[PDB]
Design a protein around this nucleic acid. Structure first.
Length: 17
RNA sequence: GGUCUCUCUGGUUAGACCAGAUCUGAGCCGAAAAGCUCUCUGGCUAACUAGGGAACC
């Protein structure tokens, strides 16, 4: 998860339930 | 003439490597902000291998 893009995906994934 | 020493190309395998994918790939954890592990695709890096070239004897 060190990559900034995964943080975006992790946040996007959390936002969609 | 011999030799993978270097280098490039193809291939195989791997990788606490770089990107992207649940704006619809999956699991784990927390009360939560978050965190952890994967899978798929492109690339990179390393090992090994064949071949071209170079280098050395």
């Amino acid at each position: 998860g060190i990559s900034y893009g995964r943080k975006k995906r992790r946040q996007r994934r959390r936002a969609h339930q």
